[PDB]
């Protein structure tokens, strides 16, 4: 079944255009409720009521303020602007213990894959919990078409930790 | 009538990049290029003050193109004109037709080969209705210079008495009828300076048609019951064949 | 049993079966237990689609239903009737031979109209050739049918040439034929199914029954080398036979009534291949060119016989059955009388019961029989006579009621 879709696809816009507060109209609403914006996640950027709801729920007063925000007919996003929800610690935030992370460089997926597919054998040295040095000596990256696949390969290789691509 | 119809069918003629010329003959230069949208607004002050609107009768757009044709035209940046496809058998729907024996089939084959020779010319003509250039075609003979080609194509279009499609920049109007073609030849330039006024043949559909434009394979199939006038067959002479000998007895 | 054209005939699936088929398909494609089915939007949809398809299938059922000479009843009856070269007889203008008497004998074109007893026009297409004497011309009624009139002087002098004097004609009418109804056509066709056969035992019957005035018919052949026998006949009903006749070998025989002698002779002379036996002597002539390029007229003389009409006697008893609901003899007589009888056909008790009942009949029949000489009934058939047509007059149809 060779679909029409592989010569044209028509879908719905998914990410909120992923813009940044550059212009003057980058307005904020500061909450104090540690629901989803904890410290080090001090802000989130939105351009529609529904997204604020999905991160905040139409019940929480923050989504209510977003609703009364975007409901203004000439609202800021109509002139190159964004809404942003902040967070001031109202009372005794408890930051849950995290696990060590390692975020890699921004890789375009158009250059990482062509360079990987020639690399027959693998080679890593990683350490988790300061344990014995782990060396990975076989990663047949030849059969890889997207970063999700190399992510899975690294996940299978690095023992004691999980590998994700994002 | 409706204000909505305006934008809707204002964009109904979109100019392709290939830039059909006077119908495919782009081998001249457009010195000037005008269109004339006109309207008849009845004059006297309209009657009611509440609803007596809907009184701007539309008009046939004319398109005037004056240009020059030389022996050697070098076209700057325009894509090739490619022959349009013969999408006639798109819905062609056989296999319900009867089972009939060989040389009963082949008799039909001979009849088909026999009248295809007499219909296929006009069939191609209707397939290429808007654009006459690739119907008449590039002249192809090395004797005729380029002004030969422009004049004989223009005469073919003019005697053709069939509407053509004409492209002003930003619009490729679909049914222009050649109204006036004046080529002029000064005695100080070997080129030909020609002014051609076309007039759109706009015609809408009065009757209920569910299908806008079907294939040739179903165009007659979805046609509504057509009407012809009466006639007195008992008073015809041009075909007054006698009664077949197989009928007088019976 | 969905739309099976089998030995059993045509079995177009019933509407419920078609709906079940479509619903089963829709159910398998979309939803095993989920999609709704009736008195519901999708259900009404399914109903519309099944309505289209069942329209077509009932058309199939009707088309095969009209492949049957005993059920056709319509145009399809004639389409199946063209399968032999016969069609329904056309309505014929009634003829009327009258005496006109004009003072001059130049010419008479189409126009005339007479006998205002009825709002009628009886025109012609021919001149007058004799003086003021009573010279006869033939008029055709303006109404195609069994039109007729009696001798009345009520002529409407439409546009008379001179208008000499009244034209009262002698009383004799040719009825004219009303267009043949399908009901007659069914029996004529099924009986005359051998029409295109050109001079066989059935060809004579089929091509004589086309004659403008014929009413009842039979054909006979004696194919044996031995005389006084009958083997081939128009109806198989008499092949049963074993009853005397007086005919010769290698001989046909026509019994016919109502046809013009000219046309009957035309058909018999065109379609006979042997000896012919009969009293009336029909004739034919034919224009043939000699190889020297001359002209002459052969006369084909052939003998046919007109049936000796007769009577028939019926021994019938009726049992009326609701206390105080007596039979009506008159209705029974007028029904049992109206049975059309074919030429020399066996009248048997066995069919006459069906004609001895009327639409709402309170009486049963328990002792019925037939006889030829007003007496001496016999429990089964009795023979009419090979050249004898029969009727059942209201006079001799005797009915005996039994009270209850």
């Amino acid at each position: 079944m060779a679909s029409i879709s592989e010569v044209i696809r028509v879908s719905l816009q998914q990410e909120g255009r992923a813009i940044a507060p550059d212009n003057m109209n980058a307005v904020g609403i500061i909450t104090g409720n540690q629901g989803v914006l904890s410290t080090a996640d001090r802000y989130r950027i939105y351009r529609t009521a529904a997204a604020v709801a999905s991160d905040f729920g139409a019940s929480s007063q923050e989504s209510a303020f977003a609703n009364t925000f975007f409901d203004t007919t000439p609202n800021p996003i109509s002139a190159g602007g964004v809404l942003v929800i902040g967070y001031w610690r109202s009372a005794s935030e408890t930051v849950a213990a995290t696990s060590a992370t390692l975020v890699s460089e921004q890789t375009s997926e158009s250059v990482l894959i062509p360079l990987l597919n020639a690399i027959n054998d693998g080679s890593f040295t990683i350490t988790v919990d300061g344990g014995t040095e782990q060396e990975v000596t076989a990663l047949d990256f030849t059969g890889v078409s997207e970063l999700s696949e190399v992510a899975t390969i690294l996940n299978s290789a690095i023992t004691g930790a999980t590998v994700s691509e994002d | 009538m409706s204000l909505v119809n305006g934008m809707v069918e204002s964009l109904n003629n979109t100019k392709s990049e290939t830039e059909i010329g006077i119908g495919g003959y782009r081998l001249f230069a457009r010195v000037r290029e005008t269109v004339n949208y006109r309207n008849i607004v009845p004059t006297d002050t309209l009657e009611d003050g509440s609803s007596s609107t809907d009184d701007i009768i539309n008009e046939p757009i004319t398109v005037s193109i004056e240009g020059v044709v030389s022996n050697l035209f070098v076209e700057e940046r325009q894509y090739p004109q490619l022959v349009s496809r013969d999408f006639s058998a798109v819905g062609e729907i056989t296999a319900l037709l009867p089972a009939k024996s060989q040389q009963q089939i082949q008799r039909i084959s001979q009849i088909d080969s026999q009248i295809r020779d007499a219909v296929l010319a006009a069939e191609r003509a209707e397939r290429l209705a808007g654009k006459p250039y690739e119907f008449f075609g590039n002249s192809g003979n090395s004797a005729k210079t380029e002004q030969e080609k422009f004049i004989d194509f223009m005469e073919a279009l003019y005697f053709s008495r069939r509407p053509t499609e004409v492209s002003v920049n930003f619009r490729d109007y679909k049914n222009m009828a050649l109204v006036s073609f004046i080529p002029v030849r000064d005695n100080n330039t070997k080129d030909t300076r020609f002014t051609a006024d076309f007039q759109q043949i706009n015609y809408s559909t009065l009757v209920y048609t569910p299908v806008s434009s079907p294939s040739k394979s179903v165009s007659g199939k979805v046609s509504d019951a057509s009407n012809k006038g009466g006639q007195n067959p008992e008073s015809n002479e041009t075909g007054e064949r006698s009664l077949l000998s197989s009928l007088v007895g019976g | 049993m969905s739309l099976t054209f089998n030995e059993n005939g045509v079995q177009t699936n019933t509407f419920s079966e078609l709906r079940a088929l479509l619903e089963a398909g829709y159910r398998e494609i979309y939803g095993t237990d989920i999609v709704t089915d009736q008195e519901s939007p999708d259900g009404q949809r399914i109903n519309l689609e099944t309505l289209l398809r069942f329209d077509i299938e009932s058309a199939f059922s009707w088309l095969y239903s009209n492949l049957d000479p005993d059920l056709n009843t319509g145009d399809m009856q004639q389409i199946i009737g063209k399968l032999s070269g016969l069609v329904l007889l056309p309505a014929s203008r009634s003829q009327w031979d009258v005496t006109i008497n004009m003072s001059r004998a130049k010419t008479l074109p189409a126009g005339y109209t007479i006998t205002d007893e009825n709002n009628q026009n009886w025109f012609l297409d021919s001149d007058v050739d004799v003086l003021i004497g009573d010279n006869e011309v033939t008029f055709l009624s303006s109404l195609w049918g069994s039109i007729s009139g009696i001798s009345g002087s009520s002529f409407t002098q439409a546009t008379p040439e001179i208008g000499v004097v009244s034209i009262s004609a002698s009383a004799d009418a040719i009825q004219g034929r009303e267009e043949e109804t399908p009901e007659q056509f069914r029996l004529r066709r099924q009986r005359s199914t051998e029409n295109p056969a050109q001079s066989t035992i059935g060809s004579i019957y089929a091509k004589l029954a086309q004659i403008n005035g014929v009413t009842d018919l039979q054909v006979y052949d004696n194919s044996s080398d031995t005389p006084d026998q009958i083997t081939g006949s128009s109806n198989p009903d008499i092949l049963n036979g074993s009853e005397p006749v007086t005919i010769g070998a290698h001989t046909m025989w026509v019994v016919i009534e109502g046809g013009s002698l000219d046309d009957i002779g035309e058909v018999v002379a065109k379609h006979r291949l042997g000896n012919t036996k009969g009293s009336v002597q029909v004739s034919y002539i034919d224009t043939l060119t000699k190889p020297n390029g001359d002209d002459f007229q052969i006369v084909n003389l052939h003998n046919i016989d007109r049936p000796v009409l007769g009577d028939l006697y019926v021994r019938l008893t009726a049992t009326q059955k609701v206390s105080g609901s007596p039979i009506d003899t008159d209705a029974i007589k007028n029904k049992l009388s109206l049975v059309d009888f074919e030429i020399g056909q066996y009248v048997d008790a066995d069919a006459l019961y069906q004609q001895s009942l009327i639409t709402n009949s309170n009486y049963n029949v328990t002792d019925l029989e037939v006889s030829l000489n007003g007496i001496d009934w016999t429990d089964g058939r009795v023979f009419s006579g090979y050249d004898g047509k029969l009727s059942i007059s209201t006079s001799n149809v005797t009915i005996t009621t039994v009270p209850v």
Partner: protein, 173 residues
């Protein structure tokens, strides 16, 4: 995927040729209509005197005035579909009698009639090519037959007048 289904599915626009539910549904409609198309196409196949059994044969009888009731007894064609009484015709015999009757309906008293259809041609393809008519002397009609027909059948046809016969007839053995 026969011709009917394929040529009709082209009326599915290409948004819907590949979505499985839509294609299946369109195929469902096309299939239900396709059984009617097949029925119309096979009507000719399954109707004529050859490929006819049971009621249609009887129908043909009543269209050619020949009921399966010949009131005579013929031995059985012992070389299930249908059984009748003894004194009726098993199908195949009644088929080929109806063929003979169809012939004799369009008879003519000419053995090589150039204008109209002859006796010889129509009796010959009545028996599908196992009959041969030559005249006699006292208007006898001698009739040769292939040995693939029992005497019972032919003597019955002559004894029921189903063979083509203008005035006189006979057979030969």
């Amino acid at each position: 995927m026969s011709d009917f289904l394929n040529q009709y599915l082209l009326y599915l626009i290409k948004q819907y040729y590949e979505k499985p539910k839509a294609n299946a549904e369109a195929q469902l409609l096309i299939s239900t209509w396709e059984t009617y198309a097949d029925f119309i196409a096979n009507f000719g196949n399954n109707f004529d005197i050859d490929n006819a059994e049971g009621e249609v044969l009887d129908l043909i009888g009543r269209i050619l005035d020949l009921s399966r009731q010949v009131n005579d007894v013929i031995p059985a064609s012992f070389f299930t579909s249908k059984v009748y009484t003894d004194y009726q015709l098993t199908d195949t015999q009644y088929r080929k009698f109806l063929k003979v009757k169809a012939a004799k309906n369009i008879c003519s008293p000419y053995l090589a009639s150039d204008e109209k259809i002859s006796l010889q041609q129509v009796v010959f393809d009545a028996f599908d090519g196992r009959a041969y008519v030559v005249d006699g002397k006292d208007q006898t009609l001698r009739l040769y037959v292939s040995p693939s027909i029992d005497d019972d059948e032919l003597r019955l046809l002559i004894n029921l007048d189903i063979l083509p016969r203008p005035i006189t007839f006979r057979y030969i053995i």
